[PDB]
Amino acid sequence: RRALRLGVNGLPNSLEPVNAISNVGPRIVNQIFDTLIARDFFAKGAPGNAIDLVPALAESWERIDEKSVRFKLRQKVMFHDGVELTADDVAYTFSSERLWGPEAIKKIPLGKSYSLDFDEPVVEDKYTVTLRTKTPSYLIETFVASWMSRIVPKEYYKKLGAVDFGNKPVGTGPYKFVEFVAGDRVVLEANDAYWGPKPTASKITYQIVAEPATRVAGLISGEYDIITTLTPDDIQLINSYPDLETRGTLIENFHMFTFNMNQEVFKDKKLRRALALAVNRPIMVEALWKKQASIPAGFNFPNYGETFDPKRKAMEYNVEEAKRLVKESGYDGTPITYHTMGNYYANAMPALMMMIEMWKQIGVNVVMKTYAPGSFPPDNQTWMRNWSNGQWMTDAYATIVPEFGPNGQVQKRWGWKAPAEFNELCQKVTVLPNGKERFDAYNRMRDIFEEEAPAVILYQPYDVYAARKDVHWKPVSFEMMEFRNNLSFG
Ligand SMILES: CC(C)[C@H](O)[C@@H](O)C(=O)NP(=O)(O)O[C@@H]1C[C@H](O)[C@H](n2cnc3c(NP(=O)(O)O[C@@H]4[C@@H](O)[C@H](O)[C@@H](CO)O[C@H]4O)ncnc32)O1
């Protein structure tokens, strides 16, 4: 076969599937690992956005009650080291020890905050395991199809520890691990024992090319087969080449900017709300995205299904109100830093430049502070910063509760003093079934989020890739790359 060469925007700090949840991690861990349930993005001729759930490591599954789903596992599946996958590896994957228990915080910092209210799994036999929650939860199924639920080998994982495992991953996926050089590359090779639609590449290299211009020059050279994290501003040049083309889709993710609310200037919602009210998203969508970005009506997305509100109003744009709020705040005109890891997010630096001018017009002075990967300063040294959230469930629970809820990093690490009402509705939605009460609680949470402005939603980016026309691969509507039945050459 042919070795696949990818020019990427970045690499994760770990290949441990939960510690790799990011914009740059899933495109690699999707190859090394498998989930029990998988999403079939290409079902019924869909352009990589189908929401269909198909069996993967679990040949079948059945909800027993409001707290548990029994999985019947595929037999003779092998981990990359020849160890057979059993219900024991599945129990360990979702165990208190490895993922949601108090001890797990040390190994997987965000594991507990991103997990459901789990109870210990029950192994029925070598190929049957029941995944359980201590309280009623109809979210088990979407969680098991997610980036939180890639299956790890119990013995090898325990032998190495979560940290050492992140540097030498072992999974059941189509590509086995070969090498990980931090700040340089990840090399994978075909797992010809995949259970499993056969890998079509002999090797895959994820090479960091932090500058998008060097990434485009690389594809034209051509040092790469496919490049990631481009901007619609690159579309005309790449598409003029006869052997090159762009492939892009709107993904189930939103770009945003957030604050360190532990800082004096961001303790009260007034200056956060003023900055949010001056963000002119429609011009940013023209200037930078060429109409290829979607401004959502709040923390509300179609993939939420029954908890998506299609009648919700757009987020407010009000420069006069923003001006008044800056005057009403204790802000004195002192510069505020906004940290960004270059263009890790597409259009991050041109978006900040545009917003800096919008903010200067309402009386706020924002300065760009750029930083290299691995050099993010202590929390204490940061004020504003960009971020993104992948909506990883077919429900509104993610990501408002895992990220912005009472037990999340935005309140616990970044200092958001959320109102009591916001945290009460977070608990209610987690345990209430779908209905009038749960739909309304999410809307009231969305209304609270906009007034509080702990983060400011910008848009759903159109994820732009560029590839050699002789590399047949289609983007999916998520921050990952899929090669199963979606990769061929010539
Ligand atoms: C281990 C330490 C001892 C060590 O020194 C070092 O590793 C360190 O500094 N660690 P620290 O904790 O300070 O991590 C730093 C702190 C800072 O906030 C930054 N950051 C966090 N999420 C990031 C991200 N998310 P993303 O947008 O690509 O991916 C998101 C993901 O964050 C999110 O959880 C998920 C679901 O909403 O959506 C993805 O889209 N993209 C780029 N930067 C990110 O990394």
Three state DSSP letters for the chain: CEEEEEEECCCCCCCCCCCCCCCCCHHHHHHHCCCCEEEECCHHHCCCCCCEEEECCEEEEEEEECCEEEEEECCCCECCCCCECCHHHHHHHCCHHHHHCHHHHHCCCCHHHHCCCEEEEEEEECCEEEEEECCCCCCHHHHHHCCCCCCCCHHHHHHHHHHHHHHCCCCCCCEEEEEEECCCEEEEEECCCCCCCCCCEEEEEEEECCCHHHHHHHHHHCCCCEEEEECHHHHHHHHHCCCEEEEEEECCEEEEEEECCCCHHHCCHHHHHHHHHCCCHHHHHHHCCCCCEECCCCCCCHHHHHHCCCCCCCCCCCHHHHHHHHHHCCCCCCCEEEEECCCCCCCHHHHHHHHHHHHHCCCCCEEEEECCCCCCCCHHHCCEEEEEEECCCCCCHHHHHHHHCCCCHHHHCCCCCCCHHHHHHHHHHHHCCCCHHHHHHHHHHHHHHHHHCCEEEEEEEEEEEEEECCEECCCCCCCCCCCCCCCEEC
* Spatial separation of the C-alpha atoms in residues 488 and 201, rounded to whole Å: 8
Packing angle of the helix pair 420-431, 397-404 (nearest 10 deg): 130
Task: Choose the residue to mutate in 14, 303, 371, 388 for probing ligand 1, maximizing ligand atoms within 8 Å of C-beta.
Answer: 388
Domain with CATH 3.10.105.10 in the chain: 252-461
Please name the residue whose Cα sits nearest to atom 13 of ligand 1. Answer: 376
Which candidate, 150, 134, 153, 127, places its Cα nearest to that of 70?
127
* Spatial separation of the C-alpha atoms in residues 137 and 66, rounded to whole Å: 6
Residue 479: CB within 6 Å of ligand 1?
Answer: yes
Q: CB neighbours of 474 closer than 8 A, spacing ≥ 6?
A: 42, 47, 48, 247, 482, 486
Q: CB neighbours of 109 closer than 8 A, spacing ≥ 6?
A: 19
Residue 256: CB within 6 Å of ligand 1?
Answer: no
Look at the alpha carbons of 366, 450, 141, 64 in this order and tell me if their dihedral is positive or negative: positive
CB-CB contact of 71 with 83 (8 Å)? no
Domain with CATH 3.90.76.10 in the chain: 35-152
387 is in an annotated binding site: yes
CB atoms within 10 A of CB 8: 24
Packing angle of the helix pair 397-404, 436-452 (nearest 10 deg): 50
* Spatial separation of the C-alpha atoms in residues 474 and 483, rounded to whole Å: 9
Residue 341: CB within 6 Å of ligand 1?
Answer: yes
Task: Choose the residue to mutate in 387, 404, 460 for probing ligand 1, maximizing ligand atoms within 8 Å of C-beta.
Answer: 387
Which amino acid would we find at residue 23? N
Task: Provide the CATH topology of domain 35-152.
Answer: Dipeptide-binding Protein; domain 1 (3.90.76)
388 is in an annotated binding site: yes
Which technique was used to obtain these atomic coordinates? X-ray
Tokens standing for residue 338: 């906004």
Q: CB neighbours of 159 closer than 8 A, spacing ≥ 6?
A: none
Residue 19: CB within 6 Å of ligand 1?
Answer: no
Contacts 24+ apart (CB under 8 A), 431-434: 431/135, 431/136, 431/137, 433/136, 433/138, 434/138, 434/306, 434/307
Residue 23: CB within 6 Å of ligand 1?
Answer: yes
Q: φ and ψ at 194, to 5 degrees?
A: -60, 140
390 is in an annotated binding site: yes
* Spatial separation of the C-alpha atoms in residues 396 and 382, rounded to whole Å: 29
Domain with CATH 3.40.190.10 in the chain: 1-34+153-251+462-490
Which candidate, 110, 106, 96, places its Cα nearest to that of 17?
110
Domain covering 252-461: architecture = Roll (3.10)
Tokens standing for residue 175: 């590509």
Atom of ligand 1 nearest to the CA of 253: 40
Atom of ligand 1 nearest to the CA of 24: 28
CB-CB contact of 368 with 356 (8 Å)? yes
Look at the alpha carbons of 344, 348, 352, 353 in this order and tell me if their dihedral is positive or negative: positive
CB-CB contact of 162 with 108 (8 Å)? yes
Residue 460: CB within 6 Å of ligand 1?
Answer: no
342 Cα: distance to centroid of ligand 1 (angstroms):
14
Which candidate, 27, 456, 16, 30, places its Cα nearest to that of 229?
27
Domain covering 1-34+153-251+462-490: architecture = 3-Layer(aba) Sandwich (3.40)
302 Cα: distance to centroid of ligand 1 (angstroms):
25
Look at the alpha carbons of 18, 20, 22, 25 in this order and tell me if their dihedral is positive or negative: negative
Q: CB neighbours of 221 closer than 8 A, spacing ≥ 6?
A: none
Packing angle of the helix pair 269-277, 436-452 (nearest 10 deg): 90
13 is in an annotated binding site: no
Q: φ and ψ at 118, to 5 degrees?
A: -65, 150
* Spatial separation of the C-alpha atoms in residues 382 and 380, rounded to whole Å: 6
Residue 298 burial (10 A CB sphere; 0-12, 13-18, 19+): buried
Q: Residues, the chain, total?
A: 490
Packing angle of the helix pair 420-431, 436-452 (nearest 10 deg): 150
244 Cα: distance to centroid of ligand 1 (angstroms):
33
Packing angle of the helix pair 319-328, 269-277 (nearest 10 deg): 160
* Spatial separation of the C-alpha atoms in residues 118 and 250, rounded to whole Å: 32
Atom of ligand 1 nearest to the CA of 109: 12
Residue 15 burial (10 A CB sphere; 0-12, 13-18, 19+): buried
Q: Give the HSE-up count for residue 272: Cα atoms under 13 Å, Cβ half-sphere.
A: 28
Residue 229: CB within 6 Å of ligand 1?
Answer: no
